[PDB]
Structure 1
């Protein structure tokens, strides 16, 4: 039954890589359990428009006040209570996704299960940066293919695109191979991008401007390689518009980017209704955010491998107790209610740089 949000903590941690990454956590408390989610916004607006400064101000100043001490039927009722404010999806997503965790934990059910998923393990691939040359690329790829990863994503740029791809393809003619074009191209480059076609990529991710659909639709008419949209899809209606236009045949679905789990479900179902698959994008998440991603990835139209690879690839030590490790390109769903993972509070304390508490 119904749940009352009694308190909320905002905990910002700084986590060393292997220089650092800031992890904003929102914890909601209620009914003697808690829900946790992780912000994916950065200090500076590099991947998208939102920033830690603005999202946290929106949380303490607007969203938290609207929900604290209040009672709700479901996470959708929580999202509904955050008014008609424009944009700020990642901020909304912190509240919404923690609400999903909290709510699932009051029922004792795994998050994935509530969202309609029934996979017990999800397929994963890896994304690789730009390497120095054709052989160093192939070497780095081989390391990962020997780990069983089910898709390889290579960054590209002008004019480092056809070469990395052709080399990787010749050594490995059967792997699922993709590229991330990183919004570094123009309709001008349609000719170069078309050269990629003979290497049977599954898609080219977001080759043009990060906020565009119309030019993608045009570029898609000019090349045979499917395009995958990322930043240009921030909602189920964007997904609809993109697919009705022909701007892509694939969507990289990042839960926090679309404002959370429910909306991600809708994105997911709109894609399926068009016969377009989704796959789960990643963003250097701690185990909190990684767990949420895995649970969402259990939905059935997640038919291409996700960037939800092993935690130990990123951190010497994660913010949770449980390991999130994939073997042979498969990441098991972490057992337990909600996310199935648990904050390691002692370790979190040694890397916390800010913490605040909010009540009604």
Structure 2
């Protein structure tokens, strides 16, 4: 159906805030689709994304058939003046938001949740891992208490804990303490957020040999394929990355080099669901697991991980879920399978009233 309106929006949601920055696209039948990227919720930079949506993309969308999501992806991504200042960064993040909104429309029009629209479920239950208990800012005391709570009270058996102290031996100590505190059958991944260099990572990985580390996410600088490839060969600890990669080309470079074992596409960083599927298919071809980064707090990725056969487990951070018409939900470490039509990107009406910010 024809697109009749494209309206950007900015929500600043409490955890200082997570930025949900995106597009509401309306079609002639009254269906409204939502898509968004994720930000640090600084208004002036959020507005660069919304300005791209309203000022650059909206004119390319109005009057077009929203059903043509593949064709429209290319129309926007390859628009010469925009790709000139793009292929990555703010134009690509704005593209992601539009793309997700178009898929939300497709599934809504079909009257089904996105995982069903795409071809059905590949599992009866997508297992979750809890990231929210693992932030680097936590004292050891608080890291331990939250980890224990997640496992002993909330039924998680998979956690992700941040590392990245200047001296990685501090992280060895923290992880050692967590390993002593929780049951051995708890899986523990770690995440360095690109903080360390190759030699630092080599030493840390050797020192972590007995800690049963599930994966090491973003150990090295985001755009440095070779360091990751060298690290992967130097340790048995699996390397995970993808959060920060904007394109299928970047994923191909990392995957083909053996620089990543756990592939982490993100519809808010790549060009939406469209480019996500391309990367997930690339991972499938290599028989590598797809574990997407929660740039949208898993609101979209729950669908993709219920559907795409290379998927395994799914990141859980509960910050924003209750602000959506269909919150993600985890019970005893398993994601509920979505039921509502669309991609569960639709915020509650009150979310705009309470947390919305002016785009201009």
- Give TM-score, length-normalised by structure 1: 0.86
| In structure 2, distance between residues paired with 1:120 and 1:55 | 37
Distance 2:35 2:57 in 1: 15
Could you tell me which of 39, 52, 61 is aligned with 1:58? 52
Where has structure 1 moved over 6 Å in runs of 4 or more?
A: none
Q: Work out the CA distance in 1 between the residues paired with 2:190 and 2:246.
A: 21
Residues 1:166 and 2:170 aligned together: no
* Residue-pair matches, total: 339
Find the residue that maps to 1:211 and give its secondary structure: coil
Distance in 1 separating the partners of 2:293 and 2:243: 11
- Number of the residue aligned with 2:337: 333
SS in 2 for 1:275: coil
1:286-305 per-residue CA deviation (whole Å, 9 max, x = no partner) reads xxx643121112122111x2
What's the C-alpha RMSD, in Å, of the aligned pairs?
Answer: 2.4
1:136 Cα deviation after fit: 4.3
Which structure 1 segments of 5+ residues have no match?
Answer: none
Residue pairs, 1:1-360, within 5 angstroms: 3-17=1-15, 19-30=16-27, 31-43=29-41, 51-84=45-78, 85=83, 86=86, 87=88, 88-118=91-121, 119=123, 121-127=125-131, 128-130=134-136, 131-133=138-140, 136-146=142-152, 147-158=154-165, 159=167, 160-171=170-181, 172-189=183-200, 190-283=202-295, 285=296, 290-298=298-306, 299-303=308-312, 305-309=313-317, 311=318, 314=319, 318-340=322-344, 342-354=346-358
Q: Distance in 1 between matches of 2:326 and 2:278?
A: 29
Which 5+ residue runs of structure 2 have no aligned equivalent? none
**Displacement after TM superposition at 1:343 (Å):** 3.3
Report the CA distance shift for 1:323/1:234 in structure 2 as closer, same or farther (over 3 A). closer
Measure the CA separation in 2 of the matches of 1:155 and 1:179.
5
- Do the aligned partners of residues 29 and 139 (structure 1) sit closer, same or farther apart at CA in structure 2, a change above 3 Å counting? same
Task: State the distance in 2 between where 1:10 and 1:272 align.
Answer: 34
Distance 2:212 2:268 in 1: 30
State the 1:354 CA deviation. Answer: 1.6
Q: Distance in 2 between matches of 1:138 and 1:179?
A: 15
With the length of structure 2 as denominator, give the TM-score of the two structures. 0.86
1:104–1:114 Cα contact (<8 Å) kept: yes
